[PDB]
Design an enzyme around this catalytic site. Structure first.
Site, PDB file in Angstrom:
ATOM      1  N   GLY C 173       0.805  -1.202   0.000  1.00 16.79           N
ATOM      2  CA  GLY C 173       0.000   0.000   0.000  1.00 16.79           C
ATOM      3  C   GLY C 173       0.842   1.258   0.000  1.00 16.79           C
ATOM      4  N   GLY C 174       0.183   2.369   0.360  1.00 18.25           N
ATOM      5  CA  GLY C 174       0.722   3.729   0.142  1.00 18.25           C
ATOM      6  C   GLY C 174       2.035   4.046   0.830  1.00 18.25           C
ATOM      7  N   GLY C 414      31.909  10.732 -23.968  1.00 15.36           N
ATOM      8  CA  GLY C 414      31.048  11.262 -22.896  1.00 15.36           C
ATOM      9  C   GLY C 414      31.145  10.538 -21.559  1.00 15.36           C
ATOM     10  N   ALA C 415      31.454   9.237 -21.567  1.00 11.13           N
ATOM     11  CA  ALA C 415      31.582   8.495 -20.297  1.00 11.13           C
ATOM     12  C   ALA C 415      32.843   8.964 -19.496  1.00 11.13           C
ATOM     13  CB  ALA C 415      31.632   6.991 -20.541  1.00 11.13           C
TER      14      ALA C 415
END
Lengths: 506, 342, 506
Positions: C173-174, C414-415
């Site tokens: 649940g929440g 880019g890495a």
């Protein structure tokens, strides 16, 4: 048909209509038959027309203690929301003494909290209209938890947003403390009371017999306790006073107090004196001990009206709001017609809280001074003149708003210190030719200094004057009384853009 | 700190009032704005300097003297003791002595003095006890009482718990049944603000039936002046720990370190009686010695407040010293100005 | 006698005893029969012996909805308080699945709120032990209000005090959003689950058949969802991991991470090489693309153990805690044994949140770099590599803690930027002689640069190395692998006293 959109909307219209008379239309008729406004009509009267937005109108209590579940009025006994006063946003609650006697319960308390939080959050004044019997005893200690929360919020908001309490019925028990924590308490004469414990318990405990009116009425909290700032002649008079009061004040501590249009410069002060200004030149009596009305100075300095605070308390000092050249000012003035303008415990506390209020809300302090000393007396010492008189020193030394002082006549001893002395941090100091500034009056000084009517006369012609302080620079200008208004106006313009906390004597 | 060591007359006495603590010497020092001679001529009242402004006057009547010393040396002793609790300034921790070691469960660390607390509260809810009997047993060593001869329905002072300076605020059942009044509220308000300025945790011991009922209390400003204690407490940011030993009714409950006034840790003894008001007054509204007995046995207790979370723990009285020291360690690293009522 | 002091004290002992088994002794027996600890036994197991101080032990629900009032268990289904872990103060809650299935109501939520506020105010870690079905339907929307208040406190405390969630039963649940908002989620293998919606509802709605374990087991949340930081091998192991985890962390964001005794040196780095350090010299294979496990580097840099985070998720990157020269550090390392160390969506998010956590809690970030690029694939694009890969850039460029980067081998394109490049704000940049730093590998590059096996070799041998980067000052030192530990130690010592909010891609 409850299961349709139209039916749901019609059902809302019904609940709303019911919320306007949550304990029956007859309960409203009975209020009106007393000449009284309802909790919500009080709000409509105070607020601008059509400006009120209600919050939590359909609230209901959630207690099942002692058959409380059988009666769940819409609104739970208080009306809350926001609106405008003279076009500026405010937050407000108004307690409904027809609902459980206006006794606070949990949900009622939560509604006040929401509105306190809304006011703090938005930086807007908070108006409380108080009319209730105390804690809803059936609900139990949860009522006390909400009192605490409310008190705590008044403290957090203290000196941050203006907080005004209108007392419009009997306000009994715990929650009278919330008014005490706010900046201004406005009671209605004969129709409002404030007391911790009522006459019934007082009689059973002490044997004292007393009415509610005698115990906690507007006259008692004005004249005796030093707690009410205004005793309105009726409910409408009270709302008028609060609107006037708000018109001087900013919405919060980080905003300038609002100004009206200033006047254009017409030349030198000399050449801009009205007939009313010129009247000041002849106001002080020749005899240096003859009383005169300090309000005569006040009314001639102000643009229009004087909104006086605690007018029925401590008549030796006059405190209140006015405008000079469209600018809000707080007046603090000794009144020579009462104790010869001497300070005392009560005048000190009245003036001290006023000075701190002006300082919180960015209002310049103009002192008008004619102070021979402190009121002599055994009860003054027993009742704490040293500790309580010190509060005025404290309030003034702490203040960072513009400070302007005018000695019209006497300023002797420690009382000279208290009443806006330069070395207490006054910004611009002025004196009339009639100012007499000394450790002690000639009359009492000669017995020490030449250890009679001629030595006196010598000393007072030589030293009890404006010029000795003027040569020290403790007064920057000895002026013709008529020039006072023009001086203050130039000084206010010049000054317009000037620890966890301290330990003020309490 | 101001020591008054002879006759202090005139306007300079305001300096002492603006300072935090005023220590006078009994019989041998006085403070007054205006002397007896001016008073006599202006009011016709005849008064000695001692009567007008002696230590006993400023202690018991005016609420101005924090200590009345037996002589000059005793005055010095008090001032040094007072300074030992305080930091040099508001930016510095109050100084601490070494804390003790932990030695297991709370129950296994209870001294004979601790256990004495368990039997201290009388069976009769109406029988008083000296609240110094509680204070003394919580503290490491001595209690430095502040304004001991003023407003004796409240007790206020400094001690150390587990080496840590604390300010005690405690109702005194022995005078006015522990009711708050104007003078007690002011005494305790300024004390609380002083502790908060100088980084001193506030420990409240609560046994409060209400406010002292009476006409003079209203006329002389209980609402405006009683409110100073709310303000002081609500403003405080130092560790706040409250222990209700017995009564906590109505607005006086709110005042005496209630959770929703921002207390950090709230405790109660099994003899705590936390209610809107006493059973006898309550039954008249709520609904007769049978009604009253059922109201007290149902509601006049620690548990309804315990269930709302207003108290964090109902505890054996003996456990009070241990809980406090633990909470003090837990809590050890937690506008121009406001507009308190004056 | 309940009207005596002694009787009142006896009654308290009685209430306390009952609170240890609030729904009966039988319910405790059923928990133990499964081999599980109660809510409070989990607290006693975790915390130092005898250190627990319980709060709100005797709380009871105040609901009367639907016969709820007939069952009012002491404690309302959660055990809360404070104590110590390794002599340092913490605050704690532990949910009781035997009390209304461990479902949250008003009073239970209140108790949790009290310890959250206590943790925030004291500046001490908050531990939540989660085991329960989520909001009590019977209580109504009030339970959801408490959810909201708890989530909001989690957000407020976020990055301020360490927040650890132990999931020790089925959490449905929440409320499982609260663990998500905290910094670390520790689950127990086989014996703990989290899910918003259960298998029953999923089957009726979608027709999918799934077990609770498959849906939201520790393994599911480790390997698939990226939500569990540790999958423990039992409750005690889960406790052991949290104590260890807390040993690296300060109490709050204002405090240094705690340090152990630093060693003294025996002269220069070159002269204090252990056999373990020297092993690093021969660790990188001669063959440029042969995998080696990056743990082989990590364990040789660290003083003792490596506390690994999300060890079974996104295994192309390795993150976690260790100490170098007594100082806590956060390791972020490409793993050449998974995708040759290529970054992907999941590895980027794993490392990015770890970097931001280190920065909140004052932990130096040490990167160990061997990254050929990003995992190619259409689903990497469709599922958000641009948006989600950016998060690692954001986290690192935002960080103000000491940052030290060591390139052991590849760093392409880019890495290279992502993985602690100089120009992303790295403090000290190091490389091994085996570093290959380039826009792209020699084989892809030759196609463009000379638009063949000879050209690659020329390109490799000329440009694919540590030195071109070392000449631009992108690496401050090219160093023997064995010197790495000594270099990071000196850099940590050198660096030890080094908007509303941004808009990270989400």
């Amino acid at each position: 048909d409850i299961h349709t959109t139209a039916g749901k909307l019609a059902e809302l219209h019904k609940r709303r209509e019911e919320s306007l008379h949550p304990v029956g239309e007859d309960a409203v008729e009975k209020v009106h038959a007393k000449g009284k406004l309802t909790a919500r009509e009080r709000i409509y009267a105070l607020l601008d027309e059509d400006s009120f937005v209600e919050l939590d109108a359909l609230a209901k209590h959630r207690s099942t203690n002692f058959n409380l579940g059988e009666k769940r009025p819409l609104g739970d006994g208080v009306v809350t929301g926001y609106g405008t006063i003279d076009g500026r946003d405010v937050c407000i609650f108004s307690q409904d003494a027809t609902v459980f006697g206006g006794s606070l319960g949990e949900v009622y308390g939560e509604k006040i909290v929401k509105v306190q939080e809304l006011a703090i959050k938005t930086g807007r004044p908070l108006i409380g209209i108080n009319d209730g019997a105390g804690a809803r005893i059936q609900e139990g200690v949860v009522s006390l938890g909400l009192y605490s929360r409310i008190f705590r919020n008044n403290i957090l908001a203290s000196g941050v947003i203006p907080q005004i309490s209108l007392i419009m019925g009997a306000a009994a028990g715990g929650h009278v403390y919330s008014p005490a924590l706010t900046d201004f308490v406005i009671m209605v004469d004969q129709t409002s009371q404030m007391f911790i414990t009522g006459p019934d318990v007082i009689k059973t405990v002490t044997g004292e017999e007393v009415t509610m009116e005698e115990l906690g009425g507007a006259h008692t909290h004005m004249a005796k306790s030093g707690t009410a700032h205004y005793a309105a002649s009726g409910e409408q008079d009270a709302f008028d006073y609060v609107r006037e009061l708000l018109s001087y004040l900013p919405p919060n501590n980080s905003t300038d107090a609002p100004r009206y249009q200033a006047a254009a410069p017409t030349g030198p002060i000399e050449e801009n004196l009205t007939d009313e200004d010129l009247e000041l030149d002849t106001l002080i009596p020749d005899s240096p001990n003859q009383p005169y009305d300090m309000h005569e100075v006040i009314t001639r300095l102000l643009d229009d009206e004087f909104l006086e605070i605690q007018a029925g308390y401590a008549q030796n000092i006059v405190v209140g709001f006015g405008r000079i050249d469209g600018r809000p000012v707080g007046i603090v003035a000794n009144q020579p017609t009462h104790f010869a303008g001497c300070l005392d415990i009560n005048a000190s506390e009245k003036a001290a809280r006023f000075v701190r209020t002006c300082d919180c809300f960015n209002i310049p302090i103009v002192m008008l001074v004619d102070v021979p000393g402190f009121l002599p007396g055994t009860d003054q010492e027993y009742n704490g003149i040293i500790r309580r008189g010190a509060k005025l020193l404290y309030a003034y030394g702490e203040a960072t708003v513009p400070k302007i002082t005018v000695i019209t006549r006497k300023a002797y001893g420690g009382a000279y210190c208290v009443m806006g002395s330069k070395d207490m941090g006054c910004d611009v100091n002025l004196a009339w030719p009639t100012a007499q500034i000394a450790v002690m009056g000639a009359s009492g000084a000669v017995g020490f200094v030449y250890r009679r009517l001629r030595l006196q006369q010598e000393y007072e012609d030589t030293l009890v004057n404006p010029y000795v302080a003027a040569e020290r620079g403790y007064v920057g200008a000895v002026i013709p009384p008529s020039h006072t208004r023009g001086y203050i106006g130039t000084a206010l313009r010049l000054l317009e853009r000037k620890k966890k906390h301290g330990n003020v004597p309490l």
